[PDB]
Symmetry: C3
Subunit: 391 residues, 3 copies
Amino acid sequence: MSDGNVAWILASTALVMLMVPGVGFFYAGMVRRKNAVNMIALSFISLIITVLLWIFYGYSVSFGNDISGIIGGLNYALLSGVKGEDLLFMMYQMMFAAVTIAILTSAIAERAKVSSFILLSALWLTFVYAPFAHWLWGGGWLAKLGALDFAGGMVVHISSGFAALAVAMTIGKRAGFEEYSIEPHSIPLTLIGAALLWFGWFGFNGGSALAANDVAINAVVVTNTSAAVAGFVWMVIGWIKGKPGSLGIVSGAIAGLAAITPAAGFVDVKGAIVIGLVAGIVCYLAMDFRIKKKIDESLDAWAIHGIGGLWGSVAVGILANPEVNGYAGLLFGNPQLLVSQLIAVASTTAYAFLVTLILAKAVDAAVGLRVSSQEEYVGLDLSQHEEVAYT
Amino acid sequence: MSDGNVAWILASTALVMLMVPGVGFFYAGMVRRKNAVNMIALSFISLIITVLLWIFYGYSVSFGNDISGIIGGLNYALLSGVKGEDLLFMMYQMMFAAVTIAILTSAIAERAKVSSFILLSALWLTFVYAPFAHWLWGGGWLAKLGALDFAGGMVVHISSGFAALAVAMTIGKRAGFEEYSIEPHSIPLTLIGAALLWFGWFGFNGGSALAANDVAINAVVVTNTSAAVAGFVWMVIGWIKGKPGSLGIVSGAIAGLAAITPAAGFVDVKGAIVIGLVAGIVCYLAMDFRIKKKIDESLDAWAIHGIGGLWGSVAVGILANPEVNGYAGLLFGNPQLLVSQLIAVASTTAYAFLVTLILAKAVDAAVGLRVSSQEEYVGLDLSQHEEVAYT
Amino acid sequence: MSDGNVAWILASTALVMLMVPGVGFFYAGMVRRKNAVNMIALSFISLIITVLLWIFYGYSVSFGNDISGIIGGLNYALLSGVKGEDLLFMMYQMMFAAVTIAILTSAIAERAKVSSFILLSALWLTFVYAPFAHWLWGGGWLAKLGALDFAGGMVVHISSGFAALAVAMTIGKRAGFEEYSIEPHSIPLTLIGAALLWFGWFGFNGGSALAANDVAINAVVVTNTSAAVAGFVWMVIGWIKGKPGSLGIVSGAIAGLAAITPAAGFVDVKGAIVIGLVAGIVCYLAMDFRIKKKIDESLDAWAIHGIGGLWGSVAVGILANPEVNGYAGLLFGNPQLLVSQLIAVASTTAYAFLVTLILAKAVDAAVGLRVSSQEEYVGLDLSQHEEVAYT
C-alpha cells in the first residue's frame, strides 16, 4: 500500500487530533480565568463525543452508500465492512469532524451548559457535518456537480463558522459583553494553542492528498504561504490601527490557513499569495462588522473560519491551476469551475446557518442552552466542572 | 527497508519522546505551585538518565543474548553490534523506558530527593524494566509461553503502576495529605500534558506494529476508541457524583489508553469498546479504593496505569481477534491465550510491586528517599532546584 | 519518489516549523511577565517574515545559480522553476531559516522595537543566512573546499549565536541588568518550549538526511545521545554549584543538541558522547564568561548555540566515522577534513559576528533598535503590542 503513504497519513492523523485540544488552548487563553478549564474541557469533550458518534454511525452517514445524493446509509455503522486503508481514511476523517466541533465552541464561550453542548454537538454532527462531508467528499450531489474542497474550506470552516454565528445569536451575548471589554486571561496560553494549530495544519492540508506525493508537497507549500500573508496583513492593520497585538497576528495567520484549506491542492504559490492577502482583509472586515453589529460570536469562529472558508472555497474556482493538479479555474480559462464553487458555497453557507439555527433553538426550547446568571457570574469552571483553573 | 516503514517509526519515536515531558506537564499541573518545576524537571531527568543507561547497557540487557530466559547479556552494551534498523528499534524502545520512569514519578510527588530518585530510577530500570522488556519482547520466558503485549500493557503500565504503589507506601504520605485536600495549581498545564500524551500515544501504540501497515492502522483506530469510551465513562461518573471535572475526563481517557496498549494490535473496534468501558469503571474504582485506604500514591499512576494495564493485558486473552492479527482469545475459541496472559499478568504484577518495594527500602536505608519536612514545606522547586516556578 | 522518503521529510518539515514558536516559549518563560507576549510574538513574526522573504527571493539566493561561490542568483525567485521534490527541499529549508531568526531574538530580549527587529531580520536573512546556506549547502565555496555541516552547526547555530552576540553589544544592556538579576516569570512556560525543541529536533537532525534511511536513524540516535550527555553535564555542574535548576538542565541538553547538529549524520555513538560531554563543558564556560564580561546577550543564544555550534562543527573534522557515512575525521586517519572544518568555522564565525555588527549599527543609526526607557519600564507587551500577558 506504499508504506510511505500510510506513514504520512498515520502521521497526518495524529497531527489533526492534536488540533482539537489545540483549539481548546487557543480559545481558553482569550476567556476569563474563571472559564479557562471549561473552554479547554469543551475541546476534549468534542473529541470524545466525536470519536464515539463517528464510529457508531457518523462515518457511515458521511461515506456510506449514497441515498439521493444528500446522505449516506448505515452500511458502515460500527465500522461494519470497513477494512484496510478505508479504516485509515475513516480515522483521518474522524479527526476533521472533531476539530470542526471544537471550532464551533467559539459561539458558546463562557455561558453554555456542557450537557446542552453535547446534545447540540451530537445533532449538529448528525444533521450538518455528516451531510456536508457526504455532499463534497462522499460522492454527494455537490461533488457530482463538480464542486471541490481540497481540505475542508466548506466541510469544516464554513460549517463551523456559520453554525457558530447561528449559535451565538441563539444563546445571546455574555453578561456585560456590551459594557466593558472581556480581557484574555492568558495570551501565552492562546499562543501555545496557535502554535499547535499551525503545526497540526501540516497534517490537515498536507494529509488531504491522501498520499506522500507532489500534491501534498504543494498543499504544504501553499498552506504556509497563505498563513504568512494573512498574518502579515493583520500585522499591518494592527500597526495602522495602533500596535500589532499578538492576537491579531495569529488570528490573521489562521484566516489564511482556513482560506487556503479548500484550495491547498489546486493552486500555485502566486494563487496562495492572493488568497492569503484577500483572506486577511475580508476576515478582518468581518470581525469589525460582527463587532459593529454587537453579535457575541465570542471568539470569531465566524469571521475567521466562516468568512475565510467562504472566500477560499470561491477562490478555488478562480485560481485553480491545471498545471498544479489538473483542475483549472476562471483565470485559467474555465468558467465552469467557478459556478460549481458558488453553488457549493451558497448551499453550504445557507444550510449551515439556517439548520444550526433550527437545532440551536430546538435544544434551547428542549433543555436550555445557557447557564444561569449566577453560574455565568462565578464562572463555568466552578459551576460546570466544580474546578478552579489556577491556584 | 521500505522508506515508508522507517518514516513511520522515526516519527513514532519522536512522538513517544514527547510523551516524557508530556507526563511532566500532566503531573505538574496537579501539584502545588511550589513544586511545579520539580514535577516537570523529574520527567526531563527521567529522559536524560534513561537515554544514558539505555545506551550504556539498558538496551543490551533488554534485547541482548538471552540467559535463562530472564535477562539479556551485555553483547549490545554501548550499542556494540547494533546496526541498521536494530538501531531504530533500540531508539524507539529507549523512549518506552523513559516514559515508564516518568509515569512512576507519580508516587514521589512533592517530597522526594532528586538525587535519590535518580539512584532508584537507575536501579529500577536495571532490575525491573529491562527484565520485563526481555521477558515479553526480548524472547524471554513470558514470550516463550505465549504471552503477548502489543504496546506495553505490562512492560510499561503495570510496571510503573505497581512500582508507583510500592514507592508511595515506602516514601509515605505528603504532610497534610490526610487533613486537607491538595489542590492543583494549574489545571490548564495538566490539560496541555494530557493533549501531548494523547497525541504521542499515536506513535506509542501505532508505532508498535514496527511498520506502516494494517496492524498499525488498527492499533490507531482502537487506541482512539478505548480512550474515548473510558473518558466518556469517567465523564458520566463525574455527573453521577456531581460535575464532570476536566481532570476526571482526561484521567478516564488515559485509563482507556493504558488498557488498550497491550491489545492495540490484536482486537477489533467492538473489543476496543469493551476494554475502554471496563477500563473506565475498574480504574475509577481503584482510585476511590486507594483513596479509601489512605495511600498517597499521589497522581494515581497505580489506579490508572497499574490497573488499566492489568485489565487490558488480561483482556488480550479474552478478545484477541484472529481476523485482526491472527491471534485469538477465549471468545474466539482459544482458552490457551487467556492462561498465558494471566500467568504473565500475575508474574509482572507481583514482581513489579515486590521488587520495587525492596529497591525503594534499600535506597531509603542507603541514602533516604524523602526530603526534610522544611523542604517539603517550602517546596522542592526552591529546596531541590533553587528555582521559583512563577513570578 | 519513495513515498516513505517524502513522508519523512513532510513530517520533519512540520517538526522544524514547531520549533519556531517553541523557541518563543522557551525564551518567553525566562523574561518578565510584562514582556512575555513580546518574546513569543517575536518568534511568530520571525516565521511569518521568513516565509515571505524565502519565497520572494531567499530560497533562490540560498540555492539558486552560483555566482563566484559566495551567493546564488534569482532564478528561483518566487519559486520560479521550483518543482517536485525541490519544492519539498525549499519548504524544509525555509523552516531552518525561521528557527535561526527566532534563536537570534535572544539578544534583544525586553528592549527592542518590533519594527526594527523586522528590518534587521530581513537584512540578516539576506546578507548573512542566505550566504551561509549557499556556501555550505548550495554548492558555495565552503562545500567546494570540503567543509561539511550535516544539520546546520554553522548555517544555524554559529550564525544566530554570534549574530546574537553582535546584536546584544550593539543594543546594550537591559535597564537594571547589572544591579539586580532578572527572574524568569514562568519556568514551566520555558520547559514547554524546551520539550517542543527537543521533540522538533527529531525532524531537524533526522530530516537532514533527506530520506528515511540509515543516516537519519543514526542522526536521531546521536542527537538524543549528545543532548542527554550535555544535559547530564549541566546537571552535575548545577549540583557542584548548589542545586540543579531545571533551566541549567534543559540549557545543557540544548547545548548538546546544537553541538551534535553539524555532525549528526557523520559520527558514531561514542563520538556523540564526546561531543555532548565537551559541549556541556565549553558552553557552560561560555555562559559564565559572557556573564563575567557583563554582556547582556540575554538568553545565551551565543553561549549555547554559537559556542555549541562552533564546537560541534569542529568536532566533525575530528570524529567523522567513515563506517557511519563514508566521511572520516582526524581520529579516523584524515587530517584534511579537520582543516576544512576549521576554515569553515573561522569564516562563518567571523562573518556572522562582524557583518551582523555592521547591520545592527546601520539599522540603529537608520531607525534605532531599542525602545524608549519608559516602554522598557512598562514592558513591551503594552508598549509594542498594547497587550497584557495575564489577568
